[PDB]
Design a protein around this ligand. Sequence first.
Ligand SMILES: Nc1ncnc2c1ncn2[C@@H]1O[C@H](COP(=O)(O)OP(=O)(O)OP(O)(O)=S)[C@@H](O)[C@H]1O
Ligand SMILES: Nc1ncnc2c1ncn2[C@@H]1O[C@H](COP(=O)(O)OP(=O)(O)OP(O)(O)=S)[C@@H](O)[C@H]1O
Ligand SMILES: Nc1ncnc2c1ncn2[C@@H]1O[C@H](COP(=O)(O)OP(=O)(O)O)[C@@H](O)[C@H]1O
Ligand SMILES: Nc1ncnc2c1ncn2[C@@H]1O[C@H](COP(=O)(O)OP(=O)(O)O)[C@@H](O)[C@H]1O
Ligand SMILES: [Mg+2]
Ligand SMILES: [Mg+2]
Lengths: 319, 348, 643, 328
Amino acid sequence: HYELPWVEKYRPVKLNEIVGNEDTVSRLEVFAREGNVPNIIIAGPPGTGKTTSILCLARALLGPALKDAMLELNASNDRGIDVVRNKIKMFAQQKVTLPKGRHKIIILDEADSMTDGAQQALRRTMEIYSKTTRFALACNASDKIIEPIQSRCAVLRYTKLTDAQILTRLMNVIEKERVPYTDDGLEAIIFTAQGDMRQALNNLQSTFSGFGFINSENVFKVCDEPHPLLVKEMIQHCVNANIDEAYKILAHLWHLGYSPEDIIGNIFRVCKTFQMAEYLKLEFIKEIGYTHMKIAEGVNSLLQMAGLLARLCQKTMAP
Amino acid sequence: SLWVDKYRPCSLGRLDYHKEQAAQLRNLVQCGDFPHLLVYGPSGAGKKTRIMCILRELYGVGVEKLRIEHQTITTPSKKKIEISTIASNYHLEVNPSDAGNSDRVVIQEMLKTVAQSQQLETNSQRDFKVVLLTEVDKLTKDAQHALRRTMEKYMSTCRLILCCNSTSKVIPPIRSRCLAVRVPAPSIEDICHVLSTVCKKEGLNLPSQLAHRLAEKSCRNLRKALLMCEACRVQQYPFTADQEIPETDWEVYLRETANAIVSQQTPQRLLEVRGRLYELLTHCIPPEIIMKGLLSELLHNCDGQLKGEVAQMAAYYEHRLQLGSKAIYHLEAFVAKFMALYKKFMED
Amino acid sequence: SFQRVVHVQQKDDGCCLWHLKPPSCPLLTKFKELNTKVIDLSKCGIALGEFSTLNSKLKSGNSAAVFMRTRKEFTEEVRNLLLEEIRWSNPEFSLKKYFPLLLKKQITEDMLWTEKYQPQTASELIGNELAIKKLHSWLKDWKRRAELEERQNLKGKEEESRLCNTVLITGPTGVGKTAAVYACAQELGFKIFEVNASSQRSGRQILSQLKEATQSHQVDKQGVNSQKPCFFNSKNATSLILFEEVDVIFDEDAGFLNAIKTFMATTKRPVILTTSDPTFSLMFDGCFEEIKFSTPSLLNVASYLQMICLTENFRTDVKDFVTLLTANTCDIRKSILYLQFWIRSGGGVLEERPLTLLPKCDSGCAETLFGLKNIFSPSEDLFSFLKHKITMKEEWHKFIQLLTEFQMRNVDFLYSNLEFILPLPVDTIPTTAGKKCSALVSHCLNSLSEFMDNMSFLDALLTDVREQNKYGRNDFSWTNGKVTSGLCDEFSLESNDGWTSQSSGELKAAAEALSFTKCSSAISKALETLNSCKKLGRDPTNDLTFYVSQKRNNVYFSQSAANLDNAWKRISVIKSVFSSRSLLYVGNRQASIIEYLPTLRNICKTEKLKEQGKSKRRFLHYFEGIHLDIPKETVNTLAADFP
Amino acid sequence: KPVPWVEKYRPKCVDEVAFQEEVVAVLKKSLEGADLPNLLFYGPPGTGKTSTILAAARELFGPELFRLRVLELNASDERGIQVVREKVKNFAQLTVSGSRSDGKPCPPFKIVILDEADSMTSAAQAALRRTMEKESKTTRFCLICNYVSRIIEPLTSRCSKFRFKPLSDKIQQQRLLDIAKKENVKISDEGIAYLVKVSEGDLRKAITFLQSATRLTGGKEITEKVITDIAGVIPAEKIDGVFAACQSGSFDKLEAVVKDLIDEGHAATQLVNQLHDVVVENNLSDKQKSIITEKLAEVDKCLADGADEHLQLISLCATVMQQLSQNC
Ligand SMILES: Nc1ncnc2c1ncn2[C@@H]1O[C@H](COP(=O)(O)OP(=O)(O)OP(O)(O)=S)[C@@H](O)[C@H]1O
Ligand SMILES: Nc1ncnc2c1ncn2[C@@H]1O[C@H](COP(=O)(O)OP(=O)(O)OP(O)(O)=S)[C@@H](O)[C@H]1O
Ligand SMILES: Nc1ncnc2c1ncn2[C@@H]1O[C@H](COP(=O)(O)OP(=O)(O)O)[C@@H](O)[C@H]1O
Ligand SMILES: Nc1ncnc2c1ncn2[C@@H]1O[C@H](COP(=O)(O)OP(=O)(O)O)[C@@H](O)[C@H]1O
Ligand SMILES: [Mg+2]
Ligand SMILES: [Mg+2]
């Protein structure tokens, strides 16, 4: 009777249902089929399928022994210095009868949030008990994991999902949910989720719950980004060196309540795929990056964005 | 113990130049409530020896002994940083610019411990301990704000001495409460006087022509003059008027780098110049010093209208070097833009 | 209450500025009427692929390439050929004395390769031969003392020796300190008692539970003795105490330094200290023998991993391993673990390369090490992708993803490998036609200068993902750089920004890719006209060559454009020179090196040149003649030359 | 033991201040009912805002309680706004009993002297707004700021705003002569005129400079040279030399002049300030003034970023030389 979220309802159960990062997913597939997986650290952007891949790997490796041979510790758990020295170490020393080539798995989700002292204690207990236990860590920024932890593991890299893969999984969810849609709504959902599959599924479910149909206006009504048509028109006006119309669009966006940050972010995202020459695109990207740095430093006014549009207009009006 | 520190004066009466300023600093000390000092001037001018003379005038002879201690301070981002420190019973000396953007992690904490020691140590000599701040011009904005709040908080507890080369980067709040002591570079005759006095105290005699040549080659740097005189002493037992003053190795390396820049303007030569600049950077030579030396050795071969453009380009890329992190990009960008401009000038 | 608020301004009568009116000039009176009418987005529908890389056509059969690799066991002949190939690759390596040991080690699996190929005998340690020689010798004297004690006990019923009861082993992570002490202990029959940071080690705990290991015998002297009981509290074998990672001190480890000092004073059995923090040897007080594991040679560890893969019936090239070890900064354990992951997954790619100096080779480990295989099709090479021009949106996204994956590490990929990927000849270091050739050379130089000005723009005026010089200053510094990681269990509670890193990396990657595309396209357009100059008879191709170092040519791609060994040596000799007692009290650091160091090198060079001419011996008494207590090898280092 | 003259020679009570008439009147009407509202003092620095409100607090509260019930805080804290938020929170959380022996019960509120209020971001000012409305009755705030227009809408709409118009040179010279005669330092009156010219209407900087000159000279005569060295002002002959080198059109003498100014220890920011003051008040053309002043602004920005004084000054002097030689 309860409405399960489509993020969890359509979660992959097998390792072959995971799109994107085909090389690392295939290597994890052959390790789940064979066994003797080493200690791994999967790093990448959010929403790309790291927790899903680790869970499917451990499920395929253990099966009925997943109930007792698996120890999962995410950021909602304690994972302190005493937790690392006691609970993880007794699970490492714990006797579990497993088939040959199968080891106990200690998943440490969100190892970025793990405290440095906890990792410093984790080093040796991950090193010595490797005959019977294995460690699978998942993180977003691998720099937050200290160097001996990365030395005691194998670091696997995940990238952003290509819009083709997000489109294929979106069609997979749509064809199992009776979701009416059009192509513009699909383009809007893919745009609102820049390389994230969780954002794509959440935006699809939110647009289906709010309006029941998938077109662009519905997606941007339920997600409320600055519209890429408006930003594309502003960039086109800056290409034609029309400061008046570009500032008209910018001031309309500013009076709609959008922050400087998402306005400059959408400007960069539209400018990344804009159809112009390579030199003009390079100057536009350089000026957008300079203005974005200025926004990040603290000075974020309409004067800064008006000065950008103008530096974009004078890129074309001047040689 | 070279000649630069064996004959460093220990009291304000033994200084040879800036004698009026030395008397003024003595009168400052005798008032009993001397303020935070902001000592500034060029390198080799004599700021550190005047600060040491002030410290020996304030306390007893016990400041002349020094000891090195290492302090490990926990950053609020939870990553401990360990720094070295020269200290005595009465004064501390620190350089927090070694801590990067965590310099405030020294500033808000280290002097606080000294303040703790000011309620722990009791000597009945003076009610403060002098904290010396070396290269305070290299601090950041928030580091200087931390320093401002620190001297506000522990005014009656400890006194501050800020030694720098340029007061351009320091904030006007940090200058509005410190007495400014400008120590200009000594003149040529003053360097000749110091060189003759240091040679007589060692038992040697050097001619006036050689001393004048050393003073002119030092570019009004007394420490560089003393080091070059010691090198000339190493080279020859007697001092002759035509004795060749030996040159700095990285300076002549920079000179051949400038000659290689001028000689040919090709991508291959650009790569060798990049390799030479990397070799200089690996020798811990600061990149601002490399930029200044490159501009100094490239303006000789330039023409009058080209000189202003080359100087403005060098200043532009040195500001970029200050803003950025990897200085080889800005160094070689200046270099390559200079070869492009020089080639365009030579074709016409 | 609700008092009133007033704005009191001392407005005196007059001054012509307090009461001001809008000016009567026509320029500032005819205000333009603001219009809010923007274009209507309801009529304009968004086509597919307008804001993304979406194509109506989809590739089928090119992806999902299952390996299904069944590696046959290599015969003796091809094993001998590959062993001779590695012999050719490493002439200084003694190949023959290492292979039978690994064959015995290998002769369904359930342990990691780090413990599968764990060196049981101390001679199997790669590199650091002086350190392992010192450790093996020192444990020989300690085993000799234990046997002498046993002989004295059975018969009953030390400045000259200078046998210090402890060594401190320091080095990088994973170079093999713990492996070396374990191998030596197995060779000499010691029994390791390991105290590590993974267990509770408070001072009274470690004292009251481990003094009797040092002060007494072992009850079980025969049988199962050479084991490793890790201390915790939730032939005759001599006990040995090992302290792994002594630099890691917690608040729960109360008085651990005092406890290990009490161990230091009152022990009768050898004690090893293992750490990777270089500051600890200066922080800890007491008498200990210093042993330093330097970073091992890249070719030796590369041939060792080639041995490891050859035993597992895998044939590889030494260049891929050199790239992997350069990326892993010569971490042996990290390289072994990633090699295990990459081999047991089925290798990189099936490619054939004929080398005499046969099964297909397996190059491509460093490409999948950085996750570049997750972006590219498995028929695409990285440099082949970089050399050709880029036009279609999908491989533009591939380039952007490559650069932003390399930008999260704050590593500059296109700058570090600029020569090898620009369309220009690269060589390792050992008239109107002239106007046209000079014009082409000037065009190439202008494109290069514009590109590197753009790169300086990126480095200075754009946000970086990781905050540079966060805890120390910038690169190539001598004053510090020993920023150890955190040691406390409380959280950071910082106010960092996450949007301005994820967007910043994409922005920097996009700008770098666009600038490199512009520079490469301009250089290729300039080199299109090289045929006319070659027909004219003048060849500026030499003026167009790139002269790179030999060590940079040994890799598929480099992580940096500098020499790290050189820089580490320079900073090391700077600390060595200025650690002298007379020079410890120099206040500044910048002018200290800038002025003190070159005249010191000048005096050293003059002293060496005076001694080369057969002068009097008193000329070697200048430095210690004025009490410059500086070590002699650093004096010989300063006296060589200035590079 | 001793205290510098700038705080110890302030006005003790209200109406002892000078050159303010309406401010003192409304302040006295506030002290009459013992009801001091939220205050916003804006004006040039050293005009006497802090002295005035400290005098008002000494009028309102007893001197043994005046130090206890006021708290001087600074808004340019680099650790964020939550630090000063919790500082004022636990300063107003404590309720220490106090009384006056003169026969008047003390008002219950406390005083927070929050200076540099115009250096706060809009979010920090909003956090301050929520803190002020939280402590609406237990403590009434004051904000010392340079400009009233930097303070955001909800704070400025509720605190009474007072402008402190700057003191003239004559009243400042009279006050400085008072300080000199009362502190027993012998300094000629043209030196005091030089002091009020150098400090540029900053009476607090003038008092600090006079104290530093008194305790640095040693009771002898304070010449203009000692004041010039204390204040960091570059003497005008160096500025004239810079301008003559630029007007000559030769780069080598320009380099020599810049090197002579650099090795004398003179700051580059002070030189940029004095060149700007010279340039904006000359008979130069408007385009020359525009180009030179824009270059001075970018050079000031580059010097704040830590660029080398020598390179920035030689680039600025090259720009000035080009501007002064393109017309001749
Ligand atoms: N590659 C993928 N293929 C298919 N579905 C995916 C993929 N990645 C994410 N999803 C979907 O998105 C949900 C969330 O994915 P997660 O694996 O939890 O993301 P993540 O890799 O853990 O990133 P984090 O947790 O933010 S660091 C899954 O339950 C799936 O429904
Ligand atoms: N020189 C080497 N020769 C052979 N195997 C090595 C070598 N160095 C490391 N290994 C392998 O890598 C594993 C880990 O080495 P360790 O000795 O634990 O590293 P470490 O020197 O202790 O540095 P830490 O402990 O990470 S700070 C060993 O058990 C070996 O399997
Ligand atoms: N009055 C003086 N008489 C003799 N030698 C001096 C005198 N003043 C300075 N020196 C020498 O000049 C050098 C100045 O160096 P230092 O005090 O570090 O100045 P800075 O900090 O500006 O470099 C010292 O080594 C000192 O030996
Ligand atoms: N109007 C005035 N009347 C009397 N003294 C004044 C006046 N203005 C300034 N002063 C003196 O000048 C100094 C200015 O200090 P301060 O009140 O902090 O200035 P501000 O508050 O304007 O920054 C005080 O020591 C004070 O004695
Ligand atoms: Mg997850
Ligand atoms: Mg170890």
